[PDB]
């Protein structure tokens, strides 16, 4: 997780995706410190008297549509990529799935919290310390296989 004074969650469909075809129906939100008013005025907010600002009566209407795109943009099948047998002390012997492209090990840090040890005394570590070691990487696989 981010090492900083304040961190928040944000909606951003397929921010970490890697697809073959782009549905191109993303719902991208910006950090709360910036204005997102635009997400709620895409629709009936046409004949407006102000650039900034949405119309409340068109809220539900807008929100619904947004949820629709949230779904459409996520209509994909999860592709199976390869793995690597890891021997880092903290995830000893696990089979971490490697994303495609260069620097696959760059993502491990984000895909598996438990990998980073518990080096220091920080809220982050207090968490990692709380998790169980055994649930990471490949969990179960098909019996049938090609190659």
């Amino acid at each position: 997780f981010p090492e900083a004074a304040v961190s928040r969650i944000v909606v951003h469909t397929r921010w970490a995706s890697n697809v073959d075809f782009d549905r191109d129906s993303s719902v991208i939100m910006a950090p709360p410190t910036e204005n997102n008013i635009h997400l709620f005025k895409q629709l009936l907010n046409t004949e407006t008297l102000s650039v900034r600002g949405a119309n409340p009566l068109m809220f539900r209407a807008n929100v619904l549509h947004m949820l629709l795109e949230f779904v459409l943009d996520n209509l994909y099948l999860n592709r199976h990529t390869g793995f690597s047998q890891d021997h880092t002390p903290f995830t000893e012997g696990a089979n971490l799935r490697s994303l495609p492209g260069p620097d696959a090990e760059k993502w491990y840090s984000i895909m598996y919290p438990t990998r980073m040890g518990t080096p220091n005394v920080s809220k982050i570590c207090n968490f990692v310390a709380s998790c169980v070691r055994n649930r990471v990487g490949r969990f179960d696989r098909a019996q049938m296989m090609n190659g």
Partner: peptide, 20 residues
């Protein structure tokens, strides 16, 4: 609720909203 964590890299939050 969107608040994930305060002073995440430190041992504890002394002043202000404390979220773990």
């Amino acid at each position: 609720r969107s608040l994930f964590c305060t002073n995440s890299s430190s041992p504890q939050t002394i002043a202000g909203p404390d979220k773990h």
